């Protein structure tokens, strides 16, 4: 339950689709007094991760720039018909 993830730089419709058509997908980490953090991460991992019921309950440690941030999945966007994720909201 540990995933490496990159920091986003371009963010919008155009970037997110380019990203989402490259085996990755956008997510966001937020919580506490700190600012939110936009987080690009790989699809094929997190797709296999969510099959387990622990994923949507237990604490996940997301690795960003070396730093491991502790979070829980608060919300998630499925793709309308295809079995694949679009976006995840990680509460801290």
């Amino acid at each position: 339950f540990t995933i490496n993830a990159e920091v986003r730089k371009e963010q919008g419709k155009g970037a997110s689709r380019r990203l989402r058509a490259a085996n990755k997908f956008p997510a966001i980490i937020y919580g506490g007094k700190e600012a939110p953090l936009a987080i690009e991460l790989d699809h094929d991992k997190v797709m296999n991760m969510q099959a387990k019921a622990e994923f949507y309950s237990e604490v996940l440690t997301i690795v960003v720039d070396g730093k491991e941030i502790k979070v829980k999945a608060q919300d998630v966007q499925r793709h309308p018909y295809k079995p694949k994720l679009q976006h995840i909201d990680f509460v801290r």
Partner: protein, 136 residues
């Protein structure tokens, strides 16, 4: 055959079936028949696919129908010229965008829930898929 019990207006415009669906998550039951394709389901098709599920799983289990028509479709009689009024309402349809869960089952095995939805999917025009009630 499903149909609205009374309506504000008898006849409705054609409109356009665009965008993505809204009833995407499997809400009530365990399993569900999701519409991959785009189109419109007549009142007859829904009943025909319901009968095909209901009779496959027998008395046991429970079924939901998430789609309901509420859109009247007019049709002009044979050998009648154009104009001279909007045609008469023949049948009723439900507009189906991609993602829409049509049916949902509960209280049955996973292997025997699929076999039932194939028989339903065979009745429908739209290309469909099987979906399970996930968390979140």
């Amino acid at each position: 055959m499903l149909q609205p019990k009374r309506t504000k207006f008898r006849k409705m415009h054609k409109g356009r079936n665009r965008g993505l669906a809204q009833g995407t998550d499997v809400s009530f039951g365990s399993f569900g028949l999701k519409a991959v394709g785009r189109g419109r389901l007549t009142a007859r098709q829904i009943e025909a696919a319901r009968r095909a599920m209901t009779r496959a799983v027998k008395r046991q289990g429970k079924i939901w129908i998430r789609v309901f028509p509420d859109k009247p479709i007019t049709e002009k009689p044979l050998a009648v010229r154009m104009g001279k009024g909007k045609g008469n309402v023949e049948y009723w349809v439900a507009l189906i965008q991609p993602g829409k869960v049509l049916y949902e089952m509960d209280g049955v095995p996973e292997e025997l829930a699929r076999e039932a939805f194939k028989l339903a999917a065979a009745k429908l025009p739209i290309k469909t898929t099987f979906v399970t009630k996930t968390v979140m």
